[PDB]
Amino acid sequence: YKSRLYLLWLEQKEITKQTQTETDYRYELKLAHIRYDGTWN
Amino acid sequence: KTVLEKSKAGAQSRFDSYGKLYDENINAGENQAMTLRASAAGLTTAVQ
């Protein structure tokens, strides 16, 4: 994106819903880019 | 004459020694010692 290497990755998070308890999952989209000195944001 | 030729050959050995040390400054070892101290402190933006 605009001549800079990005990364996207999908993370899950195991949460606990209630009705007794059940295991639900929550998804997030992460995004990081590379800087000029080779480090990552 | 032999006395001053041994003094000349001794002062030539210092002019060849310190001249070799002056012409050959920082060697392959001492370049790597200052490269590592430049690399150990370039991690500020990465740790943060």
Separation CA B29–CA B17 (nearest Å): 19
Residue with tokens 């949460």: A15
- DSSP symbol at A34: B
Q: Give how far B45 is from chain A: nearest CA, Å.
A: 7
Cβ–Cβ under 8 Å, residues A39 and B46: yes
Rg (CA), chain B: 21
Separation CA B38–CA B47 (nearest Å): 16
Separation CA A39–CA B43 (nearest Å): 9
Residue of chain B nearest A38, judged by CA positions: B46
Q: Give how far B15 is from chain A: nearest CA, Å.
A: 45
Any CB–CB contact under 8 A between A37 and chain B? yes
Q: Which chain B residues are within 8 Å of A35, Cβ to Cβ?
A: 45
Tell me the one-letter amino acid at A40.
W
Maximum separation of any 2 CA atoms in chain A, in Å: 51
Separation CA A19–CA B40 (nearest Å): 54
Q: How many residues does chain B have?
A: 48
The experimental method is cryo-EM
Q: Pick the closest to residue A31 from A13, A12, A14, A10 (CA basis).
A: A10
Resolution (Å units): 3.2
Residue of chain B nearest A39, judged by CA positions: B46
Phi-psi bin for A35: left (phi > 0), alpha (psi -120 to 50), beta?
A: beta
